[model samples]
Target: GSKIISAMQTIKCVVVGDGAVGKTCLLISYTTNKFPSEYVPTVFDNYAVTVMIGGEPYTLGLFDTAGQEDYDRLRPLSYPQTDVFLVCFSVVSPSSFENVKEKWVPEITHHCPKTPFLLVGTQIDLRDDPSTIEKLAKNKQKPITPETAEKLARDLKAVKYVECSALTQKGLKNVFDEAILAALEPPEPKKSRR
Candidate 1:
């Protein structure tokens, strides 16, 4: 769909996560309202789309970026001019989860300061164990419990952190809604002179 108007500013958002972490699924659900069972691997960034938030609709060009250290050079352009960011991981992968703070956050912060971010855990519904607590324990890794996520959310000063299950349609809109609300918060307009 086209943007609401020509005058509104663009609000680009980026989703950063490891490969096969379901970043495409989340973006599809948020943008096209469809979720795929499978997909081709992302070459540069997975997908881009536009959505409306606040009274001023924005061209929210989403970038599902790669997390590999070697691909780090491309990040400067991929992450520039963004307004919001979603750093995602699957509950089963402790490495991916840990990288959120250690890798993705710092990379993005270095690129775009003052950008509002959200930490997301995907595949919450796909876990056969049916319990993040048990799974984390069984995997013998520091668990990302709700408490931990909340703490990270606070530490990052994100609008909020959420667990989203694309398979079951869980908490997806709330994530985007929080982002949109963040977008609505007025930025300091640039000074002008006659």
Candidate 2:
């Protein structure tokens, strides 16, 4: 029989962000270990998956928080002991990035301190999508750059910053890998997330 007895660490990594920022994509792609095909929503919330870091397998207790506004009221409250948070935004959606500052950041820091969060920009591949390009062009805007999110991460005092192409899983693993590191060695004076 195969041994499934794991004594490895379990990390509570909750994914939070604005509506349709695609936290669902991240959660499913990560746990499913696939590059993704058609994108959809919800396994309807939390999941348990194993990941390798430092060559040791760890159980990741993943959560997908409600990305809508009113959902905010009842959601983030239960994040009390969450080990780490991935605060995300869509690179193609400027409003989502702005809210990362105006809303999400304050939202996470409001209840706790001494916990760390990683800033994430979703939909990097959308930057190259023709329709997406047209949508932004109509608004005289463009995709958010790594420099932009990296700067925002610094300003907001995040543990690290990452962006990804949900369609391809490029830069995806990097996001969670750092999340675990931040969780295991949480930065001082930083607060928590869901």
Candidate 3:
């Protein structure tokens, strides 16, 4: 008898961001391939997605978190032993974008200081929407461009900056692809006890 079905290894991927920043949508669309009609304020669950990587089956354990001030202390419970993190922000929401630099990064690094993460720009489908642009214009703001987000990624400790839209699913696959890649091959991995 051949051992065709192998026990797979998992890469723990935890997603984090400010409330209503499209974190759940990002995970939902990726897994279910559809947009959620209603907003899910808190998605405290994990999606163990199975996939082939390098000809080996790997489980991409995607853990979702509640991005609220109230949950700031509780969020760290999911941070231990995380392989990679997707710190997300909405391109159309400047406030959410700001928290990526201020809150999410500091919090994750504080817990897993050596682990690598990616800067994710969500809701890109609205970046070009007329009403969305006008609303930001009213606030003397604009959607975060790839260049700006990229710069922040470098400024912070993220491996890189990636943008996508849950509604359109554009660049969505690449976002997770990169996350798996980062988890598998970080420039300077941190697991070794030095």
Per residue, candidate 1 scores C-alpha lDDT tens digits across 46-111 of: 344555544455455666545566766643653345467677755544444655767677755655
Per-residue accuracy of model 3 over 104-178 as CA lDDT, tens digit each: 777666655565576777766666665345545555557776666665676675766767766565666566656
**TM-score against truth, every candidate:** 0.63, 0.70, 0.68
Full ranking by lDDT:
3, 2, 1
Candidate 1, residue 38: Cα displacement in angstroms equals 6.4
Candidate achieving the largest TM-score: 2
What is each predicted model's overall lDDT from 0 to 1?
A: 0.57, 0.61, 0.62
Q: Model 3, which residues run further than 4 Å from truth?
A: 1-8, 37-45, 52-57, 66-81, 130-141, 186-194
Candidate 2 matches the true fold with a TM-score of 0.70
Candidate that would win on lDDT: 3
Instruction: Quote the positional error of residue 28 for candidate 2 in Å.
Output: 1.5
TM-score ranking, best first: 2, 3, 1
Q: Candidate 2 at residue 65, lDDT?
A: 46
lDDT of 3 at 27: 66
Name model 1 segments beyond 4 Å from true: 1-9, 38-47, 52-57, 66-80, 128-143, 183-194
- 1-194 per-residue lDDT for model 2 (tens digits): 21333334566776666523445556666677542356455345466677766565565677664454545555455444446777776677654566677767766655334565777666666656653455455555577765776667777777667677655556666666666665555335544794
